[PDB]
DNA sequence: ATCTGTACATGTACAGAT
DNA sequence: ATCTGTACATGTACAGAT
DNA sequence: ATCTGTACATGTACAGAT
DNA sequence: ATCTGTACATGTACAGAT
């Protein structure tokens, strides 16, 4: 009932060292070769540095090591941003210059830069004979260049081109990241001293803010006590709750295409808010994993029904606004969550 | 009570402003001089350390601690006679070498000479250079705002540099600040100041590590921040420093004791009692009293290990005579059992 | 001769294996 | 409870450039 | 190789609220 | 007496300019 059953699900979700080892060896080979090709010659992307992000590098990837996220980030000095129609997250970017090939009268085209980035990667991937690796068909309005690796087992790698700016963060984030009562003001001041990132979303010239680096730090430094989850401190169940929520969404999403609008970033955003609401490490005791997961489920259901889930970093941006996800989709997911909740999570046994 | 003592010890905003603006004028000018030359100390950077910059200075802003740190390349250390804290150094600076050995005395002397020269050229501030104490690592400036202000200018070598093996068991913050903090702190450089054990020796300095700890001292990240709870850790350090300053004023028998003994002791207490709730402001009396008992127990056992170099006993019979320690135990036991009368004398 | 972008060397938190 | 592979931060060597 | 500009932590000082 | 909110002050990390 309480602690158990969910501990059994977590056992299923745990990655195996052997799988991790084989997956990481291939992924690192491909990524380091693509990073090297970016440094060659008159490449506009010379200087890009690598930044590993997403669930695998936060240690909340579940089931298999089959999806990796890596940012190829390019420091770009004197830039001026114009917010795209008070949306908070989307921007136009303006200013001998290797990026002039993508300029458009002051304005740096996102899809032109991404196309050349994409073109380079496809070419370098053709020269790989070690590995069975190809490039996925492009999704319109997607920042990523996704590699598909057959190791025999299947592995996705989303390479995200990112602009790196070191100025202070855009005003729309000033009230975001409300970690003052949880990680504190010094951590917040230091995190906002780090660069911010822009990824390719006036349709084709817009960029979107990314905070994958800040999210990575928070996930690996998630406690009010510095010793949380350390070898001389107490274990918490924050990440374990994130895993169970991720797994509930993944299971439901591979069954019902009604849920196409939903994604793991909604789960990640919601639990960041829960962690803020419940800052104390004792509110995430491993013994109370059932209650901790249940109160996360209830908070997510409230967000669905009230149609309100604010971006953790950009408070005026509501990821559940009617313009992004239709009410019926949200009602559909509310019922499937409430059902799983009241019937012993039968979907955790599925497959 | 103890609150009233802390109100007396609080520095005044006005005095801080006047003293800092004078001190910064002098320090800036000396630092410029070390850069602008064929100076062999070209490259020194400033690092503000000690109680004023840790926010545990008491009574008046009349003592300032500044390191001019100089990054040096491939240096090898040899530990001086198993002491832990004292090293010979080996491999611009050729003017201070010996037989492969970089001389603390010879480098300090030139450092000292340059500073005294620049001080002669200062005609807007009343500022002299105190007579040198043998063995000491400091160049001390005496400023008269009109009030008296001390500035200890400490030359420091910077290496980076796995910390020397004598510190491997040091800094035992794992259950308090944690392993990530400890690992990151020990990724910082380590420092060497020209305190002689004789003439060629340097001593390990961890002033940059103690500063981080003083300002990052809670088990909770929010300790003492605007969205956290206040603790009484620093106020306990202030009262313990005040007890010792007042006792040292009065008895020359305590000349061998210094505020760093108190700082070392409270680092150990803070490790013993990591929880922030064990330093609740409402328990200021219990907290000060358990700090008193811990310090007495150190005196009674003649054992107070360097927080960063655990084999180095600051209370060894070699460093402080048994009689001095018994004298300080009786005077502390006395103040304790009579309501600290020494806190009432201005 | 000296300089330097790249990659190795070192150390350890995290978390899976045992 | 201990042992151990990956990721990562920082320090340092050096073939190839200068 | 040096310096200002910016942002906010750490303080002190004091009135009004509690 | 203590707490909370605002005003006032210094110290410090680091971006951007030079
Ligand atoms: C802002 N950031 C996003 C969005 N989607 C993804 N990200 C960021 O991109 C990272 C990787 O994306 P995903 O692979 O889709 O999600 P994940 O965090 O790695 O979790 P998984 O489903 O296990 O892969 C996330 O951790 C986020 O930081 C979004 O819609 N808005
Ligand atoms: N590391 C990182 N990866 C990102 C980020 N944003 C997107 N990605 C990757 O790119 C994938 C596609 O991003 P999205 O466009 O937001 O996801 P989507 O499935 O296309 O959903 P929508 O575009 O919102 O309709 C994500 O799943 C991530 O793997 C980011 O900010 N950081
Ligand atoms: C190692 N470091 C020392 C020793 N003495 C002083 N220090 C360091 O130098 C700093 C400044 O020393 P002091 O001015 O004498 O003491 P303080 O900490 O500033 O405290 P005050 O008495 O208020 O001046 C200390 O905080 C220590 O980090 C010592 O004996 N061994
Ligand atoms: N910032 C800093 N200052 C130091 C350090 N060590 C010494 N000092 C300063 O130099 C002063 C004299 O240092 P001491 O360690 O007392 O040397 P000493 O007076 O010759 O020897 P003692 O008799 O043991 O006191 C201290 O009061 C500090 O102000 C250090 O490691 N860092
Ligand atoms: Mg992912
Ligand atoms: Mg001092
Ligand atoms: Zn934890
Ligand atoms: Zn505190």
Author numbering:
A (entry chain A): 145 to 239, 245 to 350, 358 to 507
B (entry chain C): 149 to 239, 247 to 352, 359 to 507
What does the paper say about this structure?
Moreover, the ATP/ITP-soaked structure suggested that ATP and ITP are bound at Site-1 and Site-2, respectively; the carboxyl oxygen of ITP appeared to accept a H-bond from Ser366 as seen from GTP, and ATP fails to bind stably at Site-2 in all known structures (see also below for the pppGpA-bound structure). These results support the idea that the -NH2 of GTP is disfavored at Site-1 while the -NH2 of ATP at Site-1 provides a favorable interaction for site-specific ATP/GTP binding. Consistent with the idea that GTP is disfavored over ITP at Site-1, mcGAScat was more active toward ITP/ITP vs. GTP/GTP.
Cyclic GMP-AMP (cGAMP) synthase (cGAS) is essential for the host defense against cytosolic double-stranded (ds)DNA arising from various maladies (e.g., pathogen invasion, ionizing irradiation, and genotoxic chemicals). Upon directly binding to and dimerizing on dsDNA, cGAS cyclizes ATP and GTP into 2′−5′/3′−5′-linked cGAMP, a unique metazoan second messenger for initiating type-I interferon (IFN-I)-mediated inflammatory responses. cGAS is central to antitumor immunity, host defense against an array of pathogens, and regulating autoimmunity. Here, we resolve these numerous fundamental mechanistic questions in innate immunology and present a unifying catalytic mechanism of cGAS. Finally, we reveal how mouse cGAS achieves more stringent substrate selectivity and higher catalytic efficiency than the human enzyme. Together, we set forth a unifying catalytic mechanism of cGAS in which dsDNA-binding pre-organizes the active site into a rigid yet adaptable lock for two sets of keys (substrates and intermediate) necessary to specifically synthesize 2′−5/3′−5′-cGAMP.
